[PDB]
Curated annotation (Swiss-Prot), chain A:
One of its GO terms (biological process) is cytoplasmic translation. This is Large ribosomal subunit protein uL16. It holds the Pfam family Ribosomal_L16. The keyword Transport does not apply. It comes from Escherichia coli (strain K12).
Curated annotation (Swiss-Prot), chain C:
GO terms for molecular function: 5S rRNA binding; RNA binding; structural constituent of ribosome; tRNA binding. The keyword Metal-binding does not apply. GO terms for biological process: cytoplasmic translation; ribosomal large subunit assembly; translation. This is one of the proteins that bind and probably mediate the attachment of the 5S RNA into the large ribosomal subunit, where it forms part of the central protuberance. Its 5S rRNA binding is significantly enhanced in the presence of L18. This is Large ribosomal subunit protein uL5.
From Swiss-Prot, chain D:
This is Large ribosomal subunit protein uL18. HAMAP family: Ribosomal_uL18_B. GO terms for molecular function: 5S rRNA binding; structural constituent of ribosome. It holds the Pfam family Ribosomal_L18p. InterPro entries: Ribosomal_uL18_bac-type, Ribosomal_uL18_bac/euk. SUPFAM superfamilies: Translational machinery components. Keywords: Phosphoprotein, Ribonucleoprotein, Ribosomal protein, RNA-binding, rRNA-binding. Residues 1-16 are annotated as: Required for binding of the 5S rRNA/L5/L18 complex to the 23S rRNA. It comes from the Bacteria. The keyword rRNA-binding applies. This is one of the proteins that mediates the attachment of the 5S rRNA subcomplex onto the large ribosomal subunit where it forms part of the central protuberance. Binds stably to 5S rRNA; increases binding abilities of L5 in a cooperative fashion; both proteins together confer 23S rRNA binding. The 5S rRNA and some of its associated proteins might help stabilize positioning of ribosome-bound tRNAs. One of its GO terms (cellular component) is cytosolic large ribosomal subunit. It comes from Escherichia coli (strain K12).
From Swiss-Prot, chain F:
InterPro entries: Ribosomal_bL33, Ribosomal_bL33_CS, Ribosomal_bL33_sf, Ribosomal_zn-bd. This is Large ribosomal subunit protein bL33. NCBIfam families: PRK00595.1, rpmG_bact. Pfam families: Ribosomal_L33 (PF00471). Gene3D superfamilies: Ribosomal protein L33. One of its GO terms (molecular function) is tRNA binding. Part of the 50S ribosomal subunit. Cross-links to the P and E site tRNAs. The keyword tRNA-binding applies. It comes from Escherichia coli (strain K12).
Amino acid sequence: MLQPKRTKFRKMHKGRNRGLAQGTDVSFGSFGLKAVGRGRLTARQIEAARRAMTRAVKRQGKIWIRVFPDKPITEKPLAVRMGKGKGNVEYWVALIQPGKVLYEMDGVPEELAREAFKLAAAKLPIKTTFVTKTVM
Amino acid sequence: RNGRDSEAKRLGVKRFGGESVLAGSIIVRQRGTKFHAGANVGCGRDHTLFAKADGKVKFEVKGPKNRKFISIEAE
Amino acid sequence: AKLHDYYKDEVVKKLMTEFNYNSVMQVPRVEKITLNMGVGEAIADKKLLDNAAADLAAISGQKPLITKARKSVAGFKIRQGYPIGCKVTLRGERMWEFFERLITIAVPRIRDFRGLSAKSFDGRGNYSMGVREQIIFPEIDYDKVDRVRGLDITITTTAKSDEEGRALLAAFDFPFR
Amino acid sequence: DKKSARIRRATRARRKLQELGATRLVVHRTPRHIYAQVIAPNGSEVLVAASTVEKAIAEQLKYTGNKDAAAAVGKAVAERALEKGIKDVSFDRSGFQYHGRVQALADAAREAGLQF
Amino acid sequence: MKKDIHPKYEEITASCSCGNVMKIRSTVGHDLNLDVCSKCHPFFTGKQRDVATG
Amino acid sequence: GIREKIKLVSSAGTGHFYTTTKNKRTKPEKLELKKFDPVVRQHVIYKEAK
RNA sequence: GCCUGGCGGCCGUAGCGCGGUGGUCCCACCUGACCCCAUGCCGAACUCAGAAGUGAAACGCCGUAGCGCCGAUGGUAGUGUGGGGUCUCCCCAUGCGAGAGUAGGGAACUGCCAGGCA
RNA sequence: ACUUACCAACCCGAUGCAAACUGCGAAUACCGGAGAAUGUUAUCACGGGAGACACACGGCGGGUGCUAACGUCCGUC
RNA sequence: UCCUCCUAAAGAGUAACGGAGGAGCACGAAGGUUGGCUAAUCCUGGUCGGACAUCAGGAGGUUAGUGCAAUGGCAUAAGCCAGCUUGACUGCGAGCGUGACGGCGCGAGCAGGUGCGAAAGCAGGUCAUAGUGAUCCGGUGGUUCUGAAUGGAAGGGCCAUC
RNA sequence: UGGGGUAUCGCCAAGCGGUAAGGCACCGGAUUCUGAUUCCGGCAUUCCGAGGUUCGAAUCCUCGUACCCCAGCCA
RNA sequence: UAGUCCGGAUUGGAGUCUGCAACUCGACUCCAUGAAGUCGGAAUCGCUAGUAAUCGUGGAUCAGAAUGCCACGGUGAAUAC
RNA sequence: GCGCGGAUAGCUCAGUCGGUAGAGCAGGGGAUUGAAAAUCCCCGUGUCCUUGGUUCGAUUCCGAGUCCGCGCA
Ligand SMILES: [K+]
Ligand SMILES: [Mg+2]
Ligand SMILES: [Mg+2]
């Protein structure tokens, strides 16, 4: 599980998730798993999907996780009233918008990249698509 | 462990550009010298900029550091 | 002024001959000679630094400037602005007189003298060496020493490269093993 | 840099005199000349200028660039400035110590009638 | 230099066993007897006897 | 805190006093300040670090 | 007209870096220091008396875009008002409209006074 | 002093994130000045009388909550 | 209770048992002025001397410093060093800011007297924003202002102050 | 989970911001046929781990760890 | 009256002898070096007169190697209620 | 299901910035003894529960399991 090594403040406000994404082209690799839905992704979903990919295209290839969590999500325990402070940091999510290339892959044929990205897009909560490295 | 904040100090620009002032009028109550004193403007002890002559407030950008002066045009 | 005159004829002429300079002023000249004695054991004793100051007062012909600590560091148990060394900046006539005594009579009185290292340039021609005894200067009375106190010399010159400082210093014959 | 160090020494009194709005007598000392010029309160335009590079001053001097030369220049700026209706200036020493021949120049300008 | 805070730095005459009579300024305040000078010190013979071992 | 309050009394015949604060521990010496005396209307020496 | 010095406007299209050049005057380094004055030591700096020597450094000027800097048009984001949906987010009409990036521009321009040369 | 499938500072190139980051920066709002039309002075000051100081939902911007609540706490309509 | 940032929607203000931190002082120099100076860190060389105490040179640019939090400031330095000093003055104050009020804040200038500077000038505390407590009651010093027949005094007032 | 306390030589236990004190033990010598007792000498913890304030931290502050004590209620 | 002209350990250099052969690993000499040690904690030992103490000399083993062992003499106590 | 403490030599247990596996007892060899006990010295072929992964290298760090035990609305 991914999590920043050392923050600056422990608890972040909710804020909103509007507009489109910045990481949009397949930059590092050759094939990409790009988001279409909005959503947000916990570190467990990123790890689950990465294990599905790494298993699927065996220890050949090279995989880039282009998103990183760095946003702490706090929850209140059970049978605790409202108020009395902000909750506790339970997990860490990345906020996703439509357009984020969530993962990249290189060093495989395209048909294995289709296969691993299908296998791993079923571990994520957002609708997802397959993209290739377009040249300009 | 939290739950405290100071009282709001009501800083900022009190007279804007082109706004006619009397002598003595505070123009920008502020905290450092975010705005510097120009012609006919004095800077108080807490970096309050006040009209030293009558006229009109003139916000400008001068000098090699692009500082934000405040002059007063005699009027 | 003996080595200053010797400079003004034969070292200026000699270095204009060796290196193919155009300007007569492009030649290296020695700017200053700083004598530091960074005592450090004066964290507990003041008379020890006073005796150090008397020794640099004897070796050069000037009062030294007792230097203070720039930062506080705890590795050596010091504090900000605590006096920890003393130095003399010799320049002008006294630079040449001290340089004459140094290369003439002080350097040969070094114990087990093999020569001064030629790789003790800081890249910009400026020599710096260290003596381990203050006894090697003929002024320091051997019967009046209490602590052995070396010091470090630094010849600062106007040469750009360090081979150019090899040339400048070596034209005073300045031993160079 | 020696020149840049001098200018940052000058700057406080320069900006203060531009803030008050007084006609300033800017001096300028060089190892063989002294220069003196009276500058309007807008700072752009000069009024009076004398110096040792002028042959009207330089011919009657032994050496341009000592205290006698500077006293001659101060006398000249005071004379020309009184001829052009300027009476009360403020002395801009322009980064030099008020000690040597800038003191000689300014004392000589005060003897010959220029009010500061 | 300033006034009298500095030690008295008067010209003396050093003389070693090499016959090198040499007058210099030094604040000893006394004439000087030496053995080794820059002229006739075993520096080059010293380097030779250093290398000449094996 | 530790820093005490003292009266700088006037050296002229008046009873006029300024008042201020002194660290009594680190500065045990008395405090003499040529302040302004408005009854005499003149700058007189003031004494008495209490 | 060209060059140099001073004081300004302007505040990176103006600054950096690389390369070339200048000293008759100017400037800078320089020469000396018992004096005016100075160094928590030192004429290094400050200061004074000078002018032998060099433009090496510095500074100015001329090139050079390697960089900094400026920067459209178009599109995108956002958004005021009115309306709509599948409504934690968007769409429509309409008004404003970036930031980044691209083409490109670009090694400043100028006022007063003073001196040197023609 | 001799080797090394391990990690890795700084620097450079490329990619993201930030309420408590900003070498950029809107719309709107706000303050000031001038002008036309319209409005039963709508404005300000002073004086008589109050009441009220438990608010609710709905849009938009948010905090909290689980972007839960016909939840809670603000801003604005 | 008070200070700083965010929430806070680009003027001000704005809530919650919202997210983060601090104060209840220090200083007679750490204030005033005049004159001067410019950091951190790293590299290289160098006696003890070391990763890091002093010296010299270079790169670097304020990543430093600011008596103590944070924010905004600061090179003309508000940072650092030295000389002389008491303006850390007294009476006022055009005009403003800010509060429901009590109150709080900024203030050119006027008068008297002063410090620094050759002078222009600057100085009514500190780079700014925290470092605090109404009234009553009472204590101390000054001032015939009052002083229950009258002259005093007691007590009260006024000014300073605890 | 909150509040309080403790962590210092092998063990139990003192430490005041400028130095680590005691007992038992352990080590060496002596007494003794030998061991215990005894006697004479010694040593000894840079102070739980990390960061910070300070010229300087066992000492002060913050965080983590490990062990104790008190509370964790009315419905 | 000193760590000293005490003390001689340790160490460097230069040697002599014996012995096939002195590196491990002799003895002695010369020059240089010059520690610790200033009368010894608890405790413990020997000695009753030519004794203890102190001073030298010899021998056996042995090519060379004793501060040990076995002998020899010189000076020569104190004390035993 | 959730929160914890355990699995290391035949037995009973230690063991944190990852560095060639530790102790006591047991067992074996030796010294000692008339002989033995005792005492002293020496000696560990341990998949550090399984399995993957990270690292040059894992008892130790991460991911997933097996068994034992303790507690829980
Ligand atoms: K064992
Ligand atoms: Mg077992
Ligand atoms: Mg166990």
